[PDB]
Structure formats: structure tokens, C-alpha cells
């Protein structure tokens, strides 16, 4: 009962390489809406990229990608595609797809009312590397019935992103997962921490679930106090 | 608002399109036309001020700009392809739509 | 190429303040302007369409207005969950879309001291030849803080990096990690590892430390 768009295909591509993104619609027909791609480079603003009318076949592109990108749609699988060629470092961005209704009528006026969650494209000469996951273990000097901090350090992966959950998503309160930091080696690392009552360290486990889709890495790491 | 000034923009830029040399002049004129048409659709002609916004008359007045903007869009697709003569010939639709709506 | 000039680029405001964001179009776009709210890491969300129509489900403290080519987003009563970057957009035609440069909105609040924790490197990391030491500053405001690493009381320089969370959507605080990275050989050269935290909410600098092994 909900409209959604799901981008996929993002990841690492060598400079000058090609990559095809998909935008899968559900809850609505791509024939009934125009579909647009909007990208956001790290720390930068929104930049409109391209659009396609699945019904007519008409397209347009930003001057910054014209001649390199090709947008298309397959109505039978309710999906739009962005074929990106001659990729360069400045194409590194989160790519969002969004719908926009047709003229005439209220649907045209609503602009980008639904967006996908976005998929990150990284253009770089480096290679894919899965993370190593290490415990951040709470100090043995934790107060008697107070608050303890624990976490996992996710080291040396590429490209972004990794996702971190705790106890398979059952623990969300007090979780802080930090933005990744780029090391001088060119790899990323991040920490995810959580604060819990000290009186629960010995009656309940805490496991971080680390997922790095570009390398197909899923790691569960149990974090327990020091001795 | 002022519906008369929006028709000035529409008529003036339609003449720019007719005498244009390249696709950029056509695209720029059509862009100004689309904005003017969207604002014109909001106003009320001085002959239907005692009627209702939901009345058939005002519904038909707004319907004329639905058609007009669709034809601006027809011409914009071609101008965006760099097809100058085609975009000019597509804007000829706007003559007809304009002529048909002087009530 | 229609330009949308957005100002200011950033602002800080207290809870309950009225916030005004402006966007100037370089030519007429009628009322085809939308405003979006973007949380860090998430897709933009539509707030206002056709310059002044409230999108369904958006709280009524958001509103927009048009005056010629001047467009204004107003947040009448700023709430802690309103921290975001906001964008205007003109959508006169499918191929003409441009966005404003964005306005990052931060929430001002009372000082809150961080709770500090230090984490030694794990044995599994040390086996690989690297020692990461992590200092955590939890739930503090304002963001400005000084975190200094001391290794046998020798001040460290150039070998640590910081990361900061976005403002908490409820209490408007930040958390911060400082990670000291050493080779295993350098880590074994020294005994006492300490992170010293200076912040407006701490009456005196807080040190957390451990002894290697
Ligand atoms: Na070192």
C-alpha cells in the first residue's frame, strides 16, 4: 500500500569504466510517471542528471553527463536504468531516482514526491576490500550499576558503505554509528558504539552485525567486557 | 495578478520563435512561454468574475492552458534535440490554440 | 540554465525559533518551486510543492510563499528533529530542473558535558600489526571539543583522526570518536595510553587511560 523506488547496481568502478544503475518501481507503473535521476557528490548539493518518459521514449540529460550516460526503461519489469560510461572521479555520488507525474494535473505539480533510498557509485582505481571487525570492549572499571560503553571498530574497507546493526536490529537505543573516516592508505574505517546499563553486561550479549555489500562481507562480532 | 501581461510574454516569444536561427533561441523563448502560461492559468478573465472557480466556464479556461502548455512541451522536446525547423513548426500549434481562446 | 540562488548556506537556531530560508530564481518559473528536507544519509523529502502547498503528512510548522521570483521557506517553530539540509528546486520543465545550493540548519541548545570512554586495541587487531586506540565522547554540546592523545605523557601529533555524529534528533547533542593509530611495534614501545578531553561542560579536563597489557 506504499509507493517506493529502489536503486541498485552501485559500487566501485575503475576510472573510464561503465556501470548500470537500476531503479525498480513498486506500488505504481513507470508508464504513468516520468522517472528522473538526481545525484549528490559527497558533502555537495543535489544535481539533476537525466530523465526518461517510459510512455513516449523521450529523454534529456544534464550537460555534465551528456554523451556518456544513457537512460532507458523496461516497462514489463517496471524498472528504469542509468547506463554510465567513461566514468570519472567526479561522478562519485549517491544516485537517487525519483518519480514526477505528467502534465496536465496535480501530479505534475507535486514534483519529486517519491525518491528511492539512493545508491553510492565510487569511481576509483582501487580495489574492493572487505572490512575487519574488532571489539571496542568496555572497561573493567565500569561503575556498579551505571552505564557502560561498548562497540565495534570496522577497519580497512573499500568502497563505502558499510552498515552496522546491533543484535540483528533488536538494539537501537543509544547506538551511535560514526561517519567513516578515510585513512591515508585509501581505506575507510568507522566505529559503532552503544551505551547500556552496566547491570546487563552479564545477563545479555551484544553483537554487532556488519554488512559490506561491495565485498559480500557479513560479520557478526560478539563484544564482551575485559578480564 | 495580470493575465494581459502573460499574453504579452506568450505572443512576443512566439514571434521570437518564428524568426529564430538556432535551437537555443527557440528553447529560451519556449521556457519563458511555459512560465507565462502557468501563471496565466491561475488568473480569471474579466468576463467570468461573477462565476465560480469550479464552474464549467473556469474549468474550460484552465483547460485551454493545459492544451497550450502541452504544445509548448511538444516544441521543447524538439528544441532539446537541436531540431530548429521542427520546433518552429511545432510552435505553430500555439497560433491555433491562442486564436481559439480570446474569450 | 535557470539558477536558484539559496541563502543562507547555514544557520544555527534555538528550539522554538522562527527560521526563514530564501531562494531567488534567475527568471520566472511561475510557482513551480519545491522545498525538500534532507537528513544526513537519507533521500530528500518533499515539504512544499507549487511554492506554497503543504505536502501531505508534513507538519504545518513548515510553509512556503512566492513573491515574483523570490521564494521563501519558513519553519515557524523550530523542533529538534528539524536539523537537516534544506533545498529549493525549480521544476519549470523536465529537462530544466535546478536546485538551490542548500541550507544546513543546526539546533542551538544548552551546554552538555560528554561522557568519556577509552578502548584499548584488541588482540586480534594487534596480531595484524596495527593498534587502534579509540576515545569516545558521548552526547555533548556544543560540537567544539579538544581531544589530545598522550602516550607515556608524550603529546601525539598527526596520527589520530576524528569523526562526529549528526545532532541527535531528540536532545540535539553530538557524539565524537578520536582514533589513535599506531603500528604494533610503536604500541609495544610504550605503556600508558591516555586521552584527555577538554570541553565547555567539563569543569576540568577529563582523562581516561589504560596500561598496555
Ligand atoms: Na606508529
Author numbering:
A (entry chain H): 3 to 229
B (entry chain B): 1 to 103
C (entry chain L): 2 to 214
Give the original sentences from the paper that presented this experimental model.
The 12 kDa BRIL has a 4-helix bundle fold arranged with the N- and C- termini separated by a distance similar to that between adjacent TMHs of α-helical membrane proteins. We hypothesized that the addition of a 50 kDa Fab, with its distinctive elongated two-domain shape, would facilitate accurate orientation of the proteins, even when most of their structure is embedded in the membrane. Among the cohort of sABs, we identified sAB24 that was virtually universal—it bound under every manifestation of the BRIL incorporation. We affinity matured this sAB and obtained several variants with subnanomolar binding affinity to BRIL.
To delineate the interaction of the affinity-matured variant with BRIL, we determined the crystal structure of BRIL–BAG2 at 1.9 Å. BAG2 interacts with BRIL through both its HC and LC CDRs resulting in burial of 727 Å2 (HC (291 Å2), LC (436 Å2)) upon complex formation. This interface involves extensive hydrophobic, electrostatic, and hydrogen bonding interactions. Surprisingly, the LC CDRs interact somewhat more extensively with BRIL than the HC CDRs. Interestingly, in the crystal structure, the mutated residues in CDR-H1 did not make any direct contact with BRIL itself, but appear to function through a series of indirect effects affecting the orientation of the CDR-H3. F35H1 is involved in an extensive π-stacking interaction with F30HC and Y104H3. The side chain hydroxyl group of S36H1 is hydrogen bonded with the carbonyl oxygen of W102H3. We superposed the crystal structure of the BRIL bound BAG2 on to the different published structures of GPCRs with BRIL fusions (either at the termini or ICL3) to analyze whether BAG2 will be useful as a versatile crystallographic/cryoEM chaperone for BRIL-fused targets. The alignments show no apparent clashes. This implies that the epitope of BAG2 should not be occluded in BRIL-fused constructs of GPCRs and thus, it has the potential to be used as a chaperone in structure determination of BRIL-fused GPCRs either by crystallography or by SP cryoEM.
